[PDB]
Structures are given as structure tokens and as C-alpha cells.
Ligand binder design. Structure first.
Ligand SMILES: O=C(O)c1ccc(Cl)c(Cl)c1
Ligand SMILES: O=C(O)c1ccc(Cl)c(Cl)c1
Lengths: 499, 499
């Protein structure tokens, strides 16, 4: 094995005086040497306050040099961090820590009350009581490196039917979760590496593939506390960013800035632009190609298994192929891992549960047994093999629509309607109905000020590429879609509100 | 873990119909699918002939598609191949198999008698009785994949005082022995990969970093049964070679051909030229830069621990720095791993005994305990830290010369004398003597036809860069140097022949 801790420590010894963390806004830099000292010291101080290996500690913070120190220090201690989205509802967070049977929670958010008053046995730690603006608050004797087993829990990330599940990431999962950035994305070891921390740390990509990779390759992690497209493009040039991994939205922002930015603005050093673009619309992709530099690679992955597919220089966003570490198959929906589909027939994408795999969801054994089957991980996504020997992601099995014996993916239809003039957003659901089973229904929201009509949206679709049966049978023009705390559509529920 | 077998199998499933092996001379190609079938079938047939996991089998063959199949098939079975240099003396090979307590030996060499008559309990298998020109001889039912433990032995390579020691390479060592080609050398996963098999398979680089890497990255291994510089340069262009790892001699041959080859001869696709160039003279290096394309990377490594240092685009051959997976130190010669030297003081290079490390020499526990110390591997090489924070390899501790309290590395002096006009080869030894301890002595061999004199070689050195004390105190002009079966100088013994 090489654990996270080990990866980062060996790095320290290879490049003590090279820059590890940079918060350019706060005019802060730490070398690898300096960043080890602060992990060490915080680690000791949390241990001095009585808090042992294998104990789960929650982390609720937005991206900052301070939380990076906090998380590493916990792992260095031996505590198993459970990283949580700070945009979750107070209620929700308080719940997951209660369920999580967690010894403490480091927070930088208040929402503190929602916890202190959750009835949870969870010692509430203010983040700024540990470290703040780099140098931390230290006492206790330098503690020892605890033994770590390959399958022992190491970190806990959250996914999402009901409340988000808690995926346990074993110690042995770190390496391939990092190195796929190198085998797939083309990063190599070296002090030239300057990685821009745009992806949140509470996400496996933001943590393993961005933070950890950047450090473990003896490079520099550039901290970003708040995303602004121009400021970011400025960081690239100013910081010598060599690679960045960004969400489809981030990219759209960046590509348009770069376009309305002539070359002002030398993005020369940017060599890799990486993204999980299964859901990236065709339009955005190509503004990314036209307007941003460096090699673009498209990746598909999951919290459970990390990276499963990719495309260098992608033409579309849906169509990818497995790289190093991965093994994949497409099996009949609801059926044995061994039931590979014909070719051209759609099915569930499933991927080998090797070393990068999680070990189960904390305290959800049915959930786990729904997902880890005979040493395979079940994506719950629907794919098909292209005659070109690649995998086309069609959409989530859960969102699939079954309309008189036929397979309809709301996402396809959402991508066409999304371009109809006048449409600010759309979700396509299957109304519990007839023709039969389910009738394809479009819920669309107009651009500020503007009118839509079902007639006009139908003619638009009629003029479009969609096969007969895919066309919506019905439209509801709404002035907003109900979403959860995480800007994401309450599908099951929208249905109640329209049927 | 990811074992060799697993790496190659997962590849098979990602790229069944892509080309794995190519013997262009014999006009032979196999896809990954085809290459699995033949590993499977041979594996079964050796198992059918009664031969179980963990049993050591010797392999004595020059590079060929057939031996690649043989070796993989043994590992797939579960047998632990011990790969041996075919240029070893009949006597010598017969010995190492006796010592090795080996159940069988696959040979393609005769020298067969030297074994059949060695008194060894070693079933002699002709290679051509198993597989020949691709398709093999098959019987038995398809056997099962045996369980493999991370520290379980997996392969056995040979190094070299007396007879070469047998380094056991555990199952868990495969991955980083492959992936350092990607973190250091910059190879990424992909069917574009075309790797030229110039390095022999009985060498860890030839096996892990060349064969296995090429396959495991879903690429193509180009078989080379015999090295000819022009033929090779032709293979590059013709084969679309993307990378090659070659010995300092191979390179010299290739660089001179490319130079006396205009561009005839488009070496466009060659992107990585890699070598262990610690001993590469300054002249050759730079003909490699002037005359060969693609990125040049210099590596230092050992059988015991694989890759420990490297330089992208190297200026000299002696000066390198640790990459991903490695941890290194320079400690006082003969002393505790914890005795780091001052800075600028010379010492023994030692490297962390992590996952890529061997587990010991087969049946040499003192030897092992001389080499694996408190979880470090001891290179027995002498290095120094440059003020530039890099490691300079000076030479082997064993060849070091101690001349009145001073450290002299024969290799430095050998590099200067090697350019003196009229010198075809030179070795510098320390005569057991005075001034004291040891007197620096040069043994040189003239160019065909030519004369040398000590006077003239002294004036040459006098005109050269060497510091006072390094100059040879004595010359012996010899018309050959005694070498072992492996074209390498019998240092200890030359001394007898001159003193
Ligand atoms: O959540 C995802 O989309 C995701 C998660 C992990 C990885 Cl590696 C990738 Cl490429 C994507
Ligand atoms: O034997 C060597 O020189 C050697 C052995 C292994 C490696 Cl990886 C390298 Cl870079 C060199």
C-alpha cells in the first residue's frame, strides 16, 4: 500500500522547500516542509485533547488552507474524516453526524447551534480554534504514526433516494484514486505541477485527484475559497497553473471569459483541463475546445469507485472508455453481474470493485448489498456499447422513462429542449400514466420576461433530431423547479406537484 | 494490490482486439485477446503436467514472443519464475538452479546437458515444446486463477562479490515497478502505446517497465530477438514506436546511426527515450540529445527496489533526483540508516524499502540482512548531494579507492582516460599499496594497432580536469582486460594479475 499520509510525507522529504499550498488572495504560501509541521502539530493537539485512531470526525467547511491542514492532520492522527458539503441544511448535517456515531466535528460555519442542539454526542470544534491563516494553535508532545491496514477505513465521502449515504474509503484506495490523474489525465511527478483547487474538498475528485495528487506529485495546490471566472483565469496565468479539474458550470464560465478576454490573459501554462462531462451539453463542450487551452480530458467516475472511463480530446460528453485500473461491463437492468447485454442493447454500467473501491456505506448494509455485488460496483447508470467499442452513458436508471415498452432518458430530451428559444431550464419526467406505464412530460421554465407554449415547444421538437416516441406528450410551463438544498431537481416530488 | 496477472487481464478486457505482441521480423502479431488465450492454454498444460503455485521455475531464453508467453503463463499458473541471463556460463546456470531448489526450467538453448547432468532435481523443458511462433501445444482443462498474497513471492531476478544473488520480487511490487514509467517517464494509458522491446526480459526494467508496462497500458510490445541499430531505427518509424528504454550502448549505436542517416528515417513517433545512464559518458549523452528525438529521461534503479531517481532532459548522467514512490538518504559508509551525512560529504545512497522492494535474496539471509536494514534498501553506491538539491552518483562502494585518507572513484578517472587519444578501454583500480592504503593505478588497452605510454597518458591527465590526488600513480598497458561471461571487468582479479 501507499496511504495518503505516506504519499504526502514522502513528498515532503523529496521537496521540503518547494511550495505546497498557496492562497494567492490572502498572500499566503507554504512549502511542503512548512505544511508537514502544521499537520504534525494540529495532529498532536487533537490527540492531546483525547481522540484516537479509527474514530470518525466530521468536517463541514468551504475550501481553505485551514481545512486542508485540519483534514490532513486528522488522517495523520488516524481519525477517519467524514467530509460534508457546507451547503447542506443545518437539520441535514446534524442528522448525518448523529447517524454517523462521530466522536467530533470540525466546523467553519450558527449551523453550530443546529448541531449543539441535535442530541448528538459530537464534540463541536471551531476550525479557527485549530489553525487560522496558516500557523495553528499548538500543544502536546509530537504523537506517533499509527498503523494503517489496507482495508481499514480512511475517509468518508457522501453521495445520495433519501438522505446521502456515507461511503467508506479504505486506506488502500488512495493510490489509484490519485494515480489515475497520471495514467489517464497525463500528469507526471514533478515540481513543475501547479494545480488549481476549484473543485470542492468534500468531493472525492476535489480531495484525491486534486488536493492529494497535487501534493503527492511534489507540486503546488492553489487554494480557491470562492470561484470567479475572470479571477480564476487570472490565477492560471499569474500562478502558472499546469492543470485544473472543474465542473461543467465552472468550465462554461471560464470558456466564455476566455472568449470575451482576447488573449489578455496568457493561458500558456495550462496543459490539462479535466472534467466529469457526462451531462455536459454539446454546446458548452465545444466552447471549451474553441476557447480554453491545454489538453481536455473527459472522465466518468463515482464516489464508490473513483475513475471508470475517459476520453482524451472528447467529441461528445456521453461517450467514454475505461482506462488503467478499471474493468467494466454492461448487464441487463436488475440482473446478475454475469448477464452481459447483447451489443447495442442498453444496460447497467457496472465496474470491478478493485482497490479504489469503497467498502460499504456506513450503517446501511442493504444499501451496500444493493451496490457491491459479487465483487462488482453497480453504477445505477444506463449505458450502451457504441459500434466504436466505447461506452455511451445515457442517464440514471432511476430517471429512466419506460413508455410503452421503450427506454427513454429524460437527459437526452432535456438537452434538445434546453436549446429551444425561450427556455431557461427544463426537466423531463415520466408521468405515472398511459399510452402506458409512463407518458413523457416536459417541465419548462421561461427566460426572464418571456412566454412559452406547448404548441411552439412541440413544433421545435418536431423540427429536431428526436425519434418519434421521445417527443414529450405534454408540457407544463413553471416559473421554477423545486430543488433540494444542493441546487438539484426534486424529481420524485415535482411529479406530485404536477400530477 | 494489482498483480502482474491482474494488470494484464484487465487490459485484455479493455482492448481484446488491439495488438499486444508484434514480432515484425517473423511477420507475427497477436492481439491482447489472442495473447490471453495462449497464456491460459500453456498455463493449463504446465499445470496438467503437475506443477503447482509457489513452485520456482527457471527461465533461460533470449527475447522472443515465445518466452513472453512462457513467463506469463507460469505466473498465471502461480509458479514463481526465476529469470536468468542466457549468456551465463553453462556451469553457472546449472549451479543457480541447483541452489534455487527449482521444480523445473524452461530453456531455449546443449547448455541443456550442463543441467541434465548438474545433479539438479529440475525438470528440463524445451521452450519450443510449449509454444513456438505464437500458437502453442495445448491439453488439459482450463485451470483456475490461484490466490495471490501482497508479500507472496512472484518473480525472481538476478543481480551480482561471488555468484549473482536471487532477488525475490513480491506480488505487490508489480504496480509501482510499472507505474513509475508513467509518473516519472510520462507514459499514459492508451492504445497509442508502442514500446520497443530492446531491453532483455531477464532484467527488471526489460520485464516490468518495458514488457508489462506496454501491455498493462493497453499498448503494444514490439519483440526484438537481436539488436541492430539501423534495423531498430527502422522499426521505430515502421512500427510507430512511441517509447523505448535502452542501454547506454544501444543508445550510442542508435544516435550514430540517426546521425549518419539524415532523416531517412522519420523518427517522429518516438516521444520517450529512457535509460539508466549513471555510467553513461558525457560524450554519448550529448549525441543522444543532438541526434535522437523525443523526451530523454535518465533513471537510476536497482533490481532490489526498481526506480529511485531520475532527470527529465538530463545535462549529465550522474546527477538525479527521487521521483514518485521513492524516499532516499545518504548516510555515512558502514553505519546506521539514521546517520544522514553532512551536506557535501559523500556517503551511501539508501532508499525506503516500500512496496516496490524485493523481500530478500533466496537462501542468502546474511546477504539479505546486509541489504535490508530497518526497512531501508542499501544501494552500496556512493552519492553526494549537489548544492542544487540533487543526488550525484559517484560510483560503487566496492570500487571506491581510498588513497591516503581520500575518496577516489575509479569511474571518474576512467571517463577522462577513456578520451585520451589511443585508448580503447580503461579500468582504474586501487593497488594494495602505499603513499598509503591504496595507490591509484590505470590499466589501459590501446586501439588496434596503436601504442600507449605512461608518460603520454600522464601528460594527458595533467592537461585534464582531475584534481591532483586523483591522477593515476601508475599505468599498465594491457592488450585485454579479464572479464566474466557477462562482458564485465573482473576487478578483484585484475589486481592479482598486475600486483
Ligand atoms: O462524481 C463524479 O462524477 C466523479 C467522481 C469521481 C471521478 Cl474520478 C470522476 Cl472522473 C467523476
Ligand atoms: O539496474 C538498473 O540500472 C536499473 C534497474 C531498475 C531501474 Cl527502474 C532503473 Cl531506472 C535502473
Amino acid at each position: 500500500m501507499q496511504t495518503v499520509n505516506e504519499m504526502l510525507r514522502r513528498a515532503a522529504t523529496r521537496a521540503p522547500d518547494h511550495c505546497a499550498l498557496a492562497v494567492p488572495a490572502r498572500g499566503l504560501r507554504l512549502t511542503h516542509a512548512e505544511l508537514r509541521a502544521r499537520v504534525e502539530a494540529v495532529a498532536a493537539r487533537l490527540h492531546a485533547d483525547g481522540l484516537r485512531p479509527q474514530q470518525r470526525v466530521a468536517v463541514v467547511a468551504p475550501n481553505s488552507a485551514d481545512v486542508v491542514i485540519a483534514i490532513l492532520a486528522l488522517h495523520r492522527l488516524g481519525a477517519v474524516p467524514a467530509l460534508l458539503n457546507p451547503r447542506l441544511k443545518s437539520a441535514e448535517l446534524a442528522e448525518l453526524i448523529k447517524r454517523g456515531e462521530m466522536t467530533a466535528a470540525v466546523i467553519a460555519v450558527q449551523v453550530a447551534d443546529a448541531i449543539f442542539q441535535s442530541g448528538s454526542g459530537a464534540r463541536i470544534i471551531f476550525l479557527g480554534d485549530l489553525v487560522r491563516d496558516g500557523e495553528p494553535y499548538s500543544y502536546g508532545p509530537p504523537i506517533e504514526d499509527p498503523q494503517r491496514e489496507p482495508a481499514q477505513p480512511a475517509f468518508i465521502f457522501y453521495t445520495s433516494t433519501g438522505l446521502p449515504k456515507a461511503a467508506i474509503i479504505p486506506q488502500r484506495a488512495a493510490e489509484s484514486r490519485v494515480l489515475f490523474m497520471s495514467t489517464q489525465v497525463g500528469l507526471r511527478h514533478g515540481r513543475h505541477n501547479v494545480v488549481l483547487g476549484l473543485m470542492p474538498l468534500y468531493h472525492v475528485v476535489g480531495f484525491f485527484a486534486v488536493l492529494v495528487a497535487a501534493l503527492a506529485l511534489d507540486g503546488t495546490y492553489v487554494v480557491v475559497e470562492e470561484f470567479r471566472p475572470v479571477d480564476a483565469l487570472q490565477l492560471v496565468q499569474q500562478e502558472q497553473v499546469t492543470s485544473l479539474f472543474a465542473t461543467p458550470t465552472h468550465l462554461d464560465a471560464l470558456a466564455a471569459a476566455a472568449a470575451h478576454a482576447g488573449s489578455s490573459l496568457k493561458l500558456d501554462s495550462l496543459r490539462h483541463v479535466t472534467f466529469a462531462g457526462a451531462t455536459m451539453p454539446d454546446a458548452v463542450l465545444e466552447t471549451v475546445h474553441q476557447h480554453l487551452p491545454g489538453e481536455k480530458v473527459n472522465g466518468y467516475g463515482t464516489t464508490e469507485a473513483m475513475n471508470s472511463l475517459y476520453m482524451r480530446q472528447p467529441k461528445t460528453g456521453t461517450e467514454m472508455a475505461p482506462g488503467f485500473f478499471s474493468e467494466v461491463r454492461i448487464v441487463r437492468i436488475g440482473g446478475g453481474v454475469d448477464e452481459i447485454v447483447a451489443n447495442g442493447e442498453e444496460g447497467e454500467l457496472i465496474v470491478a470493485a478493485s482497490d479504489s473501491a469503497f467498502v460499504g456505506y456506513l450503517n446501511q448494509p442493504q444499501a451496500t448489498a444493493e451496490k457491491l455485488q459479487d465483487g462488482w460496483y453497480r453504477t445505477s447508470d444506463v449505458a450502451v456499447w457504441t459500434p466504436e467499442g466505447t461506452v455511451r452513458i445515457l442517464g440514471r436508471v432511476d430517471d429512466m422513462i419506460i413508455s410503452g415498452g421503450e427506454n427513454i432518458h429524460p437527459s437526452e430530451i432535456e438537452r434538445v429542449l434546453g436549446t429551444a428559444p425561450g427556455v431557461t431550464e427544463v426537466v423531463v419526467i415520466g408521468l405515472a400514466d398511459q399510452r402506458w406505464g409512463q407518458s413523457v412530460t416536459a417541465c419548462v421554465v421561461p427566460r426572464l420576461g418571456e412566454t412559452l407554449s406547448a404548441d411552439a415547444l412541440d413544433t421545435f421538437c418536431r423540427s429536431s433530431e428526436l425519434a418519434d416516441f421521445k417527443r414529450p406528450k405534454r408540457y407544463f410551463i413553471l416559473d421554477q423547479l423545486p430543488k433540494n438544498a444542493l441546487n438539484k431537481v426534486l424529481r420524485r416530488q415535482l411529479v406530485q406537484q404536477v400530477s
